[PDB]
Symmetry: D2
Amino acid sequence: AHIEGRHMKRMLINATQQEELRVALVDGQRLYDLDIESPGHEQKKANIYKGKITRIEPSLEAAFVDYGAERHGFLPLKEIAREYFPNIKDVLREGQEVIVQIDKEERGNKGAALTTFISLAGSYLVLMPNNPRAGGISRRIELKEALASLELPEGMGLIVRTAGVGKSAEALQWDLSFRLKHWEAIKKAAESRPAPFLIHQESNVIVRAFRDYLRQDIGEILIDNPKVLELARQHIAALGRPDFSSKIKLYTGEIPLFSHYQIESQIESAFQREVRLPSGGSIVIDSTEALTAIDINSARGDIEETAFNTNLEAADEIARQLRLRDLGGLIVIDFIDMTPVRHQRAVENRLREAVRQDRARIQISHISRFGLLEMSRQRLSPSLGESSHHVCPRCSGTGTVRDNESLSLSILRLIEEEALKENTQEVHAIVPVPIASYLLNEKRSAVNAIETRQDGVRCVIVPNDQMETPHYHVLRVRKGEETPTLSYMLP
Amino acid sequence: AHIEGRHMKRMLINATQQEELRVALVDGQRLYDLDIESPGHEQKKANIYKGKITRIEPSLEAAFVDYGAERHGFLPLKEIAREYFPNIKDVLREGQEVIVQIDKEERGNKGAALTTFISLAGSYLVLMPNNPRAGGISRRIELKEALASLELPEGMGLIVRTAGVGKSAEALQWDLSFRLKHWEAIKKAAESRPAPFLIHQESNVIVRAFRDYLRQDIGEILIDNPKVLELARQHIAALGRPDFSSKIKLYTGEIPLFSHYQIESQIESAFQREVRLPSGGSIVIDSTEALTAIDINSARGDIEETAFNTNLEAADEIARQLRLRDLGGLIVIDFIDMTPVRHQRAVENRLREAVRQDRARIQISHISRFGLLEMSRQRLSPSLGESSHHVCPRCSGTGTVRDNESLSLSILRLIEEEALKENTQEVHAIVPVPIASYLLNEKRSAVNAIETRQDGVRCVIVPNDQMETPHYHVLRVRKGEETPTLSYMLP
Amino acid sequence: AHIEGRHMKRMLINATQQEELRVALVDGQRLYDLDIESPGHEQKKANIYKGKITRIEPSLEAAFVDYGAERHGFLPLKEIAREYFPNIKDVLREGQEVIVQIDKEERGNKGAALTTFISLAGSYLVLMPNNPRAGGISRRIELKEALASLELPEGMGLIVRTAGVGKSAEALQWDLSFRLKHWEAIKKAAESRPAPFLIHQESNVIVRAFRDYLRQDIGEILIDNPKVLELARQHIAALGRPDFSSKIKLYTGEIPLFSHYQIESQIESAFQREVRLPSGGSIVIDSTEALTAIDINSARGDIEETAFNTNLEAADEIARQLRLRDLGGLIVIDFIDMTPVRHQRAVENRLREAVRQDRARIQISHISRFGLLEMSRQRLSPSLGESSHHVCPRCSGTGTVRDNESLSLSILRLIEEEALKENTQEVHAIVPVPIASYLLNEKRSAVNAIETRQDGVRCVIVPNDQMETPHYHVLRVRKGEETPTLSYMLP
Amino acid sequence: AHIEGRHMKRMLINATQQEELRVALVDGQRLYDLDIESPGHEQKKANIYKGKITRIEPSLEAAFVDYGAERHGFLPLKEIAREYFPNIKDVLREGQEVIVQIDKEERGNKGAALTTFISLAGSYLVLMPNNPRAGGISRRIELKEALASLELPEGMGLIVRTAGVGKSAEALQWDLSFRLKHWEAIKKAAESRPAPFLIHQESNVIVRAFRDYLRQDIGEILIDNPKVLELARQHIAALGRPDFSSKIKLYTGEIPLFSHYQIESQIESAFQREVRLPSGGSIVIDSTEALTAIDINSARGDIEETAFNTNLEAADEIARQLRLRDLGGLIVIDFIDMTPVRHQRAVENRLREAVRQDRARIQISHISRFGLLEMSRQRLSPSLGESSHHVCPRCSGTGTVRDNESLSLSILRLIEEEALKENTQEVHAIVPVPIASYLLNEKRSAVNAIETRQDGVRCVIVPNDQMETPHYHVLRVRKGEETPTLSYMLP
RNA sequence: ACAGUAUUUG
RNA sequence: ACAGUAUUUG
RNA sequence: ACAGUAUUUG
RNA sequence: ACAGUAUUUG
Ligand SMILES: [Mg+2]
Ligand SMILES: [Mg+2]
Ligand SMILES: [Mg+2]
Ligand SMILES: [Mg+2]
Ligand SMILES: [Mg+2]
Ligand SMILES: [Mg+2]
Ligand SMILES: [Zn+2]
Ligand SMILES: [Zn+2]
């Protein structure tokens, strides 16, 4: 029934649990975005090291870097600067010491994009202290005015946040001040040493939150744990939006905060693969290796509507999940199938208009002739899956598991073929129990069959209870090289 | 290196193994399509029953049917006929007895499409003995001529197969003969009884093969098992392409047939999720709930090419897998990312030109601005996954598994919330072992924490070794209704 | 180094843990007997019900009884009384209502001995209020005098405890008083109702202890838990040895009581099968179905001594374990093997002199010519094993497990023999995994072998991971009665 | 119903199965002794090596020997000879090279008795070619005559087998010939080399059988496998009892030999712990570490008899099992409990008279006053248990398993005590799952309880599913030396 | 296997 | 398989 | 968080 | 805890 503005939008902080410090942004009781920072596996994006270059490969158009973790980090010739600046190899003289920062974070293989293009964020500003090229405003929005009046040095260009819109030129000075004043240290704190090492560490979840996600609509900030609420308050001081010290309250209620604001289930919502649409429909969000791929579908009085209407809900919800899951990359949405075009353009907008908030960039094509709508969106941090799951290790990634016989027939032809391989003595499949059962009954005859022909080739087939139903081995044992050792000792 | 026509295209039949009768269609040694019919789980599509109608729902635009299995079968008002014919409810008078056939087969939920629009296939013909509306030819291709000269009765219209192109009008008579002559029986064999029952059973894999997949290019038909080769031969007789009795030879070689033609690995190929591209690239074929979704990617001298070239291979291979997997529905292909448009149109065609064969219909849009190419293709039978796998039952479908702590924190808030629920005595999470470990150490304090506050609420938390890492229960035990019974007895 | 009398003998009570209330009797720091009463599985021996008689069997020389639990209770014609008294059947008129008490307790099969011969114990006395036949004194020990002066009614006879030896005739009156005064109620509290039901419940462990195990040598009684120490004190009051209120002190020390008195390990000692002898020898206490059977053996300067000496230690220790384990029945001790007879008579006495305490009766023959010394001892309550263990359920009782092959050969001949049994179709061994492995490799040939001969008898052999290494089934499947169902589905 | 002599006594050989060559000795259909030789784990007793002496210990009264396997072998000063002969140390000069043979075989610890007192067995004779001291006859039985007439050299003395009783002096010459003629080689075949090595290998099971267990009563010798029956026949030739070539027949019957002679079950009989007595009684044969211990008990018309009679059956059966199990050492039999002494002496004899056969020596005392009858018997080879089982590895030997709580309480006090141990940080019980469950619910409070007091001592308690119910660890973690690492990662 | 095939629809 | 066999003894 | 943002790229 | 206690006996 929801109209933005009806109830109060508040920022619920949840500092009760050590191993997990959550921060939802709720409007009334509709969770509408959430964050879960937890020690150890902290935030790395937005840091700044010093850098020398493992290896210029050109077959990609960029170096790598040692900023010294595990995997040296990706660095596109595009990233590279005036100042680093004395096609690839003429550009970067290798083992060169450079001031690289992290655009996008380790993803299962890759390093991370670094970029010698350092960016710096205050509450209302953002410094590019290293290319006076790019500036601007919150493409979200007097200060256009005030901005000129900005006393900017020339090496770099700047933007002005969505959230400086309230505020007063005086203090953009008072931002663009404290930035620089960093940026300086952030400079000479490299002029120091051999660079192979960190320099600045992007600040925790809360600050970040008080920084990047706080607006005029934010009613209260209930924090549920007095000692945080401590730093809580000090952190505004600095970040400096101090018309919010008002705004920041301590939750006492015995009933757990989030669990009070009735947004718990919503939290989960985000970890489930299906997600119910108001009407009663559903939104199954499957994630492939090429693109996340959401599919939509309907409940249980009209057809045309049923679909059209349920598509609109799907629209709304998909957006929110997009946010909750920190889903990035492409996304293909399979909207139901309505006939009248107006509906298509209808829902399309519906989507657009619903992802208006999303702090990340979002691009949204028309609906296809196969009724798929593709849609990109920017990789603001690691996604929930990518950072709170892993890979059903029975499957490998895929979520099916080969029916027992078709596996066995298979294991079995493998055996036979192995058992021709000139100069084999034994050969020793080692397979999930039922596999071994099925080969040795259902199929015994065949196995037999073999050794008869393959004169004198023993095909051992030992059933085992460690193996699950898709894994297995088929080793082969060359003349002479054969233990006498028990079938079941084989392992 | 492959040019169609270089080596001989042959049909390898493999009748050695009872529980699995395979039939690849190979051109030289490149498997290029394959079939695996196995008893029991036989073929159902293309059958013909008699039919009465469980329930007209109109909120879909069609009935259902009892042709008497498990799930009565889908029947679109579109399907419905003149003759059944006395918007939905005025159309189908319910419990009406009708002559329905099966377009598309049981899929995990659905019934199957039936269609009162019976279709009938000979070797060169295909009878529509029930709408003289639709006719035509093999949109693949003198007989245009011969076809008129066809002595067709009027109730129905016909097509002429790709494969009657060789042959002679005389014998289209001699097809369109034996069809009808069926179609008659196929008619009065309903005039018989209460209809709730089968009528005609689509014939096995081999016949089918000798029927639907045999052309002029087919060199030999090596069958590897004398007794089949028996029926083998008799089946041409009838189907009646007898200039092939020549063509059909018995394989003796000790080394297993397929394993001789060096097409084994290829067989598998089709069951793996990644599949290597010639160059050395790879084609990961992930399947979601909305669309199958293939992603492509490259090896280890130029960029532009590396991608462009590897895309072409992906093209080729995707086609073949599309066929081998009997993949239907939509498919989204994430081709690498080349800049020059010519390349895009290049690969696109490449794809088109490579799926020229595919017996199923295929539609192929341009490459998107997000560099996805979407692509539909017709559901010719059940897909390999859909009929030789199942659902990594540790995951549910999805192939990740929630990291242990984030689960535990979760299980745990559930407990707490349950333990407020006014009028609870005990409450009894029952969770995967490590879950129970982690809640009871790492987190003990918190659990404690609870019962302290929740005065006198026992939260039992019994670790169990039956449960795997994502499943678990959190039952709650109402005042009075509490056994005294051992923590570990809980189950 | 231990001389009785050196250090103080004290009674350590341990009431900290709810589910287990222990009471050791220590002399210095040598645990010398211990008790472990724990709720639920409480003490039943020494109770008194009312009784009617399920069934006179005479093929044993006694009835049974309903005192109404599970197994009606054993009742020897020997037990039976004057007053019950109107060879077996002439004696007990069946369904007769009687005042039976419990000599010895449920043992895995048996009921328990009841006895219509009720016995009653005070602190210094013991009433036989139902046969003036048997009287006496503590065959352990002026009162001989005082005892005559006892104002005894005539229906029954009495004894005087080891512990009335201190005390004064006045108060044996004051015992033999409060007894009777019970015994009366204990009488008319049957004159009440239909008897099928309890009457008096033998009192808990502590009272019992303050009653049956308290002497002049008992220095303190440290109890470690204030609230018990409460009832603690009240319980002397009554039982009435009140020159002990002095004696009974509260333990505070942070370090756990028993764990302070340095008698913990000793506790366990009693649950282990081997038990180290001072010198360094060992005492393996194995328990069979016919007799508990202790074996002795030696360490690592003389032979003759080494053995003789180590036998003496074994003597000492065996006694104590005999007590700790509440071991009853026969016991055979295999003392080392010394040559000189003096040593044999030496150790024998050593044993005698060491089991002087044992509250239970003990009888001790000479050492045999096979150098076994047999030895009976009275069943004072259930034994530790019999009440705190169970039966290595992999073995059945026996503690070996048949080597894998000898089992398999066996399972296998079973199969063959089953497979002759005229009119069998299938037959379906179902066996521990490795069993199934070994039969199907190592032995395949043989299995084959069978079906060849046993024309057309399928011997299925399904390996299974539920079964451990000694269990298994060999079902057989009669012509006609054969599912087609998967080898591994068999279960 | 069995009277010795009624049916034919025959020797069934069973050479069908490679991994197990059995040889029962049956009288009619009553298995009455059996043998199971199987390759690899062959027979070692009765071999002859050459020998030098690892280490004279005197604290035992004998050396050891290197005859070079694993454990050098026991060698009693008693064993030692004239000829080895230049109290212990003056006797055996160490590292001396000697001609030792094996009396009794490796038993779980020990070496084996060797004995420089070599013994040698023909069919009718037995050479002591190394002490003319000991001679004699079959204390089982003209030849007394013939024996003098024996042309014996003087260094050694001899006996004459039970089975030379048939036969003729001529041929005792013809035995005592071929012996010596060995004994010579058996001598100079040491005069050869450095002794550290074998010399003569006691011959397989069959020969042995044709040698040590063949008498006049032996009707046939059915062997069931033509090729054996081969060597079969040749082996008499040599051993030389050739009036038996007659006697030795080939079994053909399709139904398995033993399984035909209806003695299968009997085979097993011997591996079960209970064994039914004719009447319907039972004989539970439990084996301890001190003595094998058989207990007896009765069925379901008189008492006195019931017992007396059932004791007689037990007698019979015990004997046979004694033989089948190759049970050696002491044995204590708990016969039922009859009153009249005649019965005791009755059964006693019954036993004596029934173990008349037993090839091993047997000694049998009167029945005790506790109604145990002890009984020694000679260790003719390893016992069935000792060579075809192992140790229910859940128990350790003992066949009970400590009830779950009493374990947990225990594990738990261990924890607490560990957690006082000055200078501990963490401490980390690791226990069977249910153990961990029970400590963490049932008992949580207490565990808590601890850390509260033990200020700042973390007691981790990780449940684990590898451990079964009696095993477990309680490690302790010293200040400073503490990983931060997950509860469930602990292992 | 046909211009309404294919996709979609239970 | 013997009067010192057997049991025991590592 | 800016017209070159985002997607892509290890 | 007694001279018929204890062992045994379901
Ligand atoms: Mg890609
Ligand atoms: Mg997937
Ligand atoms: Mg859909
Ligand atoms: Mg008994
Ligand atoms: Mg045992
Ligand atoms: Mg011993
Ligand atoms: Zn999975
Ligand atoms: Zn066991």
